[model samples]
Target: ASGLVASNLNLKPGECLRVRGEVAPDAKSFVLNLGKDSNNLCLHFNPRFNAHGDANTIVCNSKDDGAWGTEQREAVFPFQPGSVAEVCITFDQANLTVKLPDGYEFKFPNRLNLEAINYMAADGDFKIKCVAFD
Candidate 1:
């Protein structure tokens, strides 16, 4: 997807949505902010999703609290160097539950304001096969 699409999709809190996409081999970073203002609440995942990429990271922050003050977690997926894998996220719910490659599973919390969730973005050279909400 080209350009930022967060403000375009105003998502609310307590509400769960899915962002599934086929990450390109060169893909690097992507973000899902869960609030009107980024600092209010946001979940940032990074380092691509390729086989060579280091463990994936998920971080959260709350404006009412502080800057990206949530615990950070790394998840392992079975994606090969060029193979494609499905990445699913339940924002700010139960930390951040991520379904990794194969049957592996990872979880993190949505430790911030449960209000409006805004925006979904991607960076670097990656191809998002598709992204859909649940």
Candidate 2:
């Protein structure tokens, strides 16, 4: 429940949010979450490097009141431990698209389905340098 935090952001459609960070040398998994609060997460962007029986996987999802939604996994992983991770996220009413460091794009459904979001967070072993709006 810790590591680089962001709050009260007006992340609306047609805009992009960029998250830049460094990964721990021994990181197994790290997550970037966006939504209104801890109880609800509209987007859960997770990268797993051999965590939860997954190897170099990118898993995305949404959760409501502690209940997680369907999982969308991407096979292309561009993260290296002790390296920088740059992700640009953009969304609309229907879906959120993530552009990874390797120029790979992954899209997930917008189950939360709101006009804008105000909260963002990171968890697991990571050093987030910037959660920027650009």
Candidate 3:
């Protein structure tokens, strides 16, 4: 894991977030965090390729007060080693759904319950080619 982190997103509702990246051939896991800051997370989008002896699973969760919440998993992992992938997150008042590269969509609650957020961070064994909000 390279452990890359990105911030200053200043994200808001009605805007869609597009993340394009390539998961390393030997990637074990990676994370996309959205919220007001690092200490607080509204959505923790994690894709585990081969972590914890598991294969091809996407885990979604949230964090409040530095404590992680329940995990939501999806069996359909769209990421492949050394392959490029695209993820789009559409934000709304109640939920933000992610559109995976493989045409699968998953919904996560807006646990923080904020109309808009201003921070985002990403890390782990992946190359973040681009992140756009529009």
Which candidate tops TM-score? 2
Model 2 agreement with the true structure over 99-133: per-residue lDDT tens digits: 99999987888787867877888988778887778
**CA lDDT of 105 in candidate 1?**
61
Ranking by lDDT: 2, 3, 1
TM-score for candidate 3, please give it.
0.91
lDDT of 3 by residue, 1-134 (tens): 54556676667777899989888888889888888788788889989988876688898888988999998898698888888888999887899889999889888999878677677777887788988888
The alpha-carbon lDDT assigned to residue 42 of candidate 2 equals: 81
Ranking by TM-score: 2, 3, 1
User: How much is the lDDT of residue 33 in candidate 3?
Assistant: 83
For each candidate in the order shown, give its overall lDDT on alpha carbons: 0.51, 0.87, 0.83
Candidate 3 Cα deviation (angstroms), residue 104? 1.0
| Between candidates 2 and 3, the TM-score winner | 2
